[PDB]
Amino acid sequence: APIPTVEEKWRLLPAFLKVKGLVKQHIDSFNYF
Amino acid sequence: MLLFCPGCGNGLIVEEGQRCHRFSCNTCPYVHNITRKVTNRKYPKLKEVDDVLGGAAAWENVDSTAESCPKCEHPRAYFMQLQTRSADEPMTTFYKCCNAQCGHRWR
């Protein structure tokens, strides 16, 4: 039987990109220091 | 196998100074007198015996039965086999064949 699909999975990515992700490493490290 | 002294916990040594050999310590007078025989060694070490009898050596080891090749089956290679390393590991077999201008030696 075909397992049910969660079509919207990919929407977890934009939220992650909002709170963390690209070019946030330098900002977070400098803030912490 | 190794031994340590019950009294002091260091390694024993073997020596003779009286009618009978003795297992003794080097720091305390504890000793045991060996009256019997123990049967386990440290597996000593001497290197590869290859050319003990290299080349067309004596003919006492001749034997009757032999195998044959799958391709050509010419009349000259009688059997031989050999060993790997030590007293507690297997022994191997190789079928090497050699007339000219090739490279054969089957495992």
Binding site: - | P6, G7, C8, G9, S24, T27, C28, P29, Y30, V31, H32, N33
Partner: protein, 400 residues
């Protein structure tokens, strides 16, 4: 899995709370019991607890090699001085051990005595490890060697001989030994059993499993250096206790613009009063077509300005007030050219309607969610209170 058998009880004996020690010999097998050989002498110190033990050894039996014993004696003790010889005879009369500490605190360790139908515990006062003492070679070395022949910042706290001196301050105490063969041992062993009724309800251990979980696991931070003002996105799903229910409501409304009433109770939970929340809802959200919608000023405070990537301008909440007035007047809005009356730039129109509505091909914009039965809930008064509040707002709004 029901309890099957041997549902035995447990008991605590305080008779020996400070009197109990556990002694372990790493260097000797468990089968090689020490009980047989006669013990001779021992020493103890109460603080920085350590002990020394002196042990008889047979010299006549064959396994003692007498000659080497005599050589060791001559090497370790004076030839004929013998005033303070380590041995009374000219051979090894005895051998000694040294103790070692294992841990500072031992609270979480308890000895136990099992018995048919009962089991008795006892707190341990300390654990120590014993090892054979090799100081006698050092004594022999010393005897051979004697036969041969504005102060800077203190650092003595870290030097070993300071600890030796600290430990030397403590006087020695000696103790009379009694072996397992002595009936005195069974006499002492009587004290482990504690008397009392077999069935008693313990007064202590009152804490419930709930209390025990955070008891053994205290909060990581005893006090946080900052307060959860929650201006930005936070943990909306967990109803923060420190956040007042009116502030919670304001945060949900800030986070998300339009929902039916039933969601409020779905998210706040049945524990929250369904009536009291009306006061906050009326303070912060108005119902349109039966569905509550947030205020414009909450989303665009008068201090703020046009944030979007279009044209900067004063914070015209009235533009939002226009689109919601239209949506109260009609189910859907086909008026593509609101900018003619609002006079605002186009991106404002798409931005406001993106908040409020959904695009329909060749039919402008329509309500994002269906009509709801606003009279199912028994509040006709607030429905009317919205009706003439918006009538007055519209009358004021007509001016532009």
């Amino acid at each position: 899995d029901d309890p099957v058998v041997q549902e035995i009880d447990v008991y605590l004996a305080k008779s020996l709370a400070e009197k109990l020690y556990l002694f372990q010999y790493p260097v000797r097998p468990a089968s090689m019991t020490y009980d047989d050989i006669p013990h001779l002498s021992a020493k103890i110190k109460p603080k920085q607890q350590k002990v020394e033990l002196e042990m008889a050894i047979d010299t006549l039996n064959p396994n003692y090699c007498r000659s080497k014993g005599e050589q060791i004696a001559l090497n370790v003790d004076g030839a004929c001085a013998d005033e303070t010889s380590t041995y009374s005879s000219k051979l090894m009369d005895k051998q000694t051990f040294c103790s070692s500490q294992t841990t500072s605190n031992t609270s979480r360790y308890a000895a136990a005595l099992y018995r048919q139908g009962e089991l008795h515990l006892t707190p341990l006062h300390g654990i120590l490890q014993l090892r054979p003492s090799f100081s006698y070679l050092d004594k022999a070395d010393a005897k051979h060697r004697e036969r041969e022949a504005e102060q800077a910042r203190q650092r003595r706290v870290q030097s070993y001989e300071f600890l030796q001196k600290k430990h030397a301050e403590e006087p020695w105490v000696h103790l009379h030994y009694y072996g397992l063969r002595d009936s005195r041992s069974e006499h002492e062993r009587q004290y482990l059993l504690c008397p009392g009724s077999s069935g008693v309800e313990n007064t202590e251990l009152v804490k419930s499993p709930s209390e025990y979980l955070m008891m053994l696991m205290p909060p990581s931070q005893e006090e946080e250096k900052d307060k959860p003002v929650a201006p930005s996105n936070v943990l909306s799903m967990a109803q923060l206790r420190t956040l007042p229910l009116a502030d919670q409501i304001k945060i949900l409304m800030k986070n998300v613009k339009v929902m039916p009433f039933a969601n409020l109770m779905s998210l706040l939970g049945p524990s929250i009063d369904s009536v009291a929340v009306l006061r906050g809802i009326q303070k912060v959200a108005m119902l349109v077509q039966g569905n509550w919608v947030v205020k414009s000023d909450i989303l665009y405070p008068k201090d703020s300005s046009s944030p979007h990537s279009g044209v900067p301008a004063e914070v015209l909440c009235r533009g939002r007030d226009f689109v919601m007035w239209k949506f109260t007047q009609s189910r859907w809005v086909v008026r593509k050219e609101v900018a003619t009356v609002t006079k605002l730039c186009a991106e404002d129109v798409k931005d406001f309607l993106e908040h409020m509505a959904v695009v329909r091909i060749n039919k402008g914009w329509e309500f994002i969610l269906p009509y709801d039965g606003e009279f199912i809930k028994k509040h006709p008064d607030v429905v009317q209170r919205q009706h003439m509040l918006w009538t007055g707002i519209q009358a004021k709004l007509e001016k532009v």
